[PDB]
């Protein structure tokens, strides 16, 4: 598979290798804040990242992933819409060529400069590869980024990026604390959806925080210096690695806040 984000291999093409692209629970979606309803049944959200163990950062040709040790229940997400325990495995971002675009989810059609995805898998399925075959296998915590003040907790990420410029490069990335990427409020929207890249599997409970984090123009500029290509290959900047909003179909987006 040679999927990507360009004219020739971008999201409009994905359905030919991955027919579930046109499925019933695809992501991302536009969150219409006037149609989403507060749900009193939602339990409180629990982000337990105190014991998180980051290992490595990888340019996979699509984004850069900060990977965690998920061989035990270190860093977990529970509560909210979730039943049981979801283990953090990695986070990554999606971003734009310009500050006016980059997020996958939109809020009343508003696009943010970037979107952070903290990816967790349901431990009742034993491993990640089994979890992605299940409708409740993953929980993705999505956090919007807007450009304003710098986010100090992001700068360690920004600073390692020149060591992983091209596809297939990785670097040791230990002792990174993902709590420094969260906004103050855990108010969220939630809906059932999918992975936003191939294989597009319909295995995600999406939890999208309402409060964006602010990052600096300089910080997001450094994201845009990465490359989609491998070393020695013609330079294609890693920008606009986002899928546009997909049809909501027969889904309701629920708000955790009144
Ligand atoms: C193999 O693991 C994967 C594969 C794809 C995705 C995509 O879905 C998404 O929301 N962003 C993505 O890059 C993922 O993240 C949950 C994890
Ligand atoms: Na709207
Ligand atoms: Zn993502």
Swiss-Prot record:
Effect of residue 5 to H: Reduced proton transfer rate
Consequence of changing residue 196 to A/C/H/P: Strongly reduced activity
GO cellular component terms given for this protein: apical part of cell; cytoplasm; cytosol; extracellular exosome; myelin sheath; plasma membrane
Catalysed reactions, as listed in the record: hydrogencarbonate + H(+) = CO2 + H2O; urea = cyanamide + H2O
Keyword Nucleotide-binding tagged: no
Annotated consequence of substituting residue 195 to A: Reduced CO(2) hydrase activity
Effect of residue 63 to F: Reduced activity
Outcome when changing residue 63 to S: 2-fold decrease in enzyme efficiency, as determined by kcat/KM ratio, and efficiently inhibited by chlorzolamide
EC number: 4.2.1.1, 4.2.1.69
Molecular-function GO term, any one: arylesterase activity
Keywords on record: Acetylation, Cell membrane, Cytoplasm, Disease variant, Lyase, Membrane, Metal-binding, Osteopetrosis, Phosphoprotein, Zinc
Consequence the record notes for mutating residue 90 to P: In OPTB3; in Czechoslovakia
Remaining remarks: Target of drugs used in treatments against glaucoma disorder and breast cancer.
Illness the protein is tied to: Osteopetrosis, autosomal recessive 3: A rare genetic disease characterized by abnormally dense bone, due to defective resorption of immature bone. Osteopetrosis occurs in two forms: a severe autosomal recessive form occurring in utero, infancy, or childhood, and a benign autosomal dominant form occurring in adolescence or adulthood. Recessive osteopetrosis commonly manifests in early infancy with macrocephaly, feeding difficulties, evolving blindness and deafness, bone marrow failure, severe anemia, and hepatosplenomegaly.
Full protein name: Carbonic anhydrase 2
Organism: Homo sapiens
Lineage: Eukaryota, Metazoa, Chordata, Craniata, Vertebrata
Gene this protein is translated from: CA2
